[PDB]
């Protein structure tokens, strides 16, 4: 199915360390053989499923391989090339900055390695516009969140468009929403866009209403927003009235068992009311997928025609964090490619 890879795509929810390919993972393993890490410890194969906690544990393993600014630079360049080769024309990468005293890496030089990877990818004339959202991990705590937000505010102004926002990710069972309200509001006031992971697990309704009050610019997952266990008509209505785009990750929810099957994924629910939604990979390496494969899975599961898949891809341009100028350029690119992608 060449249509899904040829189809121009936007990627808005992709975690850098979760997007590492098998090829790049093997190069990192070759550099650190003393770690005794194997490639099957970092990937969930087709037909296999793990718990959400088991997924989080795999990130601890991957984080041991990417410990220096050179590792972050190589990972950034490889991930960008892999997305561009898959037909992605605009990518918003997500990553939590980390210090590593053993290598001299700081949260600031972690971000600078990502920006350097984006700069080197432009020098190679790749057909992809890459932006960066600084991710706050719930496990880091509220003090590290304040430092990360301050760092993001500085790069938001200095990069003039490369750094566009802030994300709140990591274990949804760790910490309280109230602990992150102040730094997230600070970022919102500075002009940063917010992409918050919400309703990933059941029975977290109060916590979800607290983060929804921040008025995020995009919501990650929103799996249980309509569920009686952790969601309500009020939460759905709030997301509907405020037209908050949902970043939907099909393979991610199925392989982490937060959804029983592709057929029962909440994509169908939100698609039925034409609510703003974007198909995303989440962690293309950990979940062994590509954005083209996610589009194919959504099209085959929900019986969408190529023209209906085209409309989804074209509308997703509206939900990027970049300016109207970028949206306009992307729309022109899509309409130029359209007769080569859609055939009689
Ligand atoms: C659990 C993580 F914080 C991982 O440590 C990180 C990996 O990417 P990076 O931020 O580049 O290190 O991405 C986050 N992450 C990766 N996938 C997910 C996910 O499905 N849900 C949530 N809540 N967070 C996720
Ligand atoms: Zn995510």
Numbering used by the authors: 12 to 355
Sentences copied from the publication:
Bemnifosbuvir (AT-527) and AT-752 are guanosine analogues currently in clinical trials against several RNA viruses. Here, we show that these drugs require a minimal set of 5 cellular enzymes for activation to their common 5′-triphosphate AT-9010, with an obligate order of reactions. Crystal structures of human histidine triad nucleotide binding protein 1, adenosine deaminase-like protein 1, guanylate kinase 1, and nucleoside diphosphate kinase at 2.09, 2.44, 1.76, and 1.9 Å resolution, respectively, with cognate precursors of AT-9010 illuminate the activation pathway from the orally available bemnifosbuvir to AT-9010, pointing to key drug–protein contacts along the activation pathway.
The asymmetric unit contains 8 copies of the protein. Although ADALP1 was co-crystallized with the substrate AT-8003, the product AT-8001 was found bound at the active site. The compound is found in all 8 chains, and all the chains found in the asymmetric unit closely superimpose (RMSD of approximately 0.26 Å) except for the minor loop and N- and C-terminal ends. The structural zinc is coordinated by side chains of 4 residues (His 24, His 26, His 208, and Asp 293) and a water molecule, in a trigonal bipyramidal geometry. Once the substrate is bound, the catalytic water attacks the purine C6, which likely stays at this location while the methylamine is leaving in the opposite exit channel. In the case of ADALP1, unlike HINT1, the substrate and products are superimposable in the crystal structure, indicating that this complex should be reliable and useful for drug design.
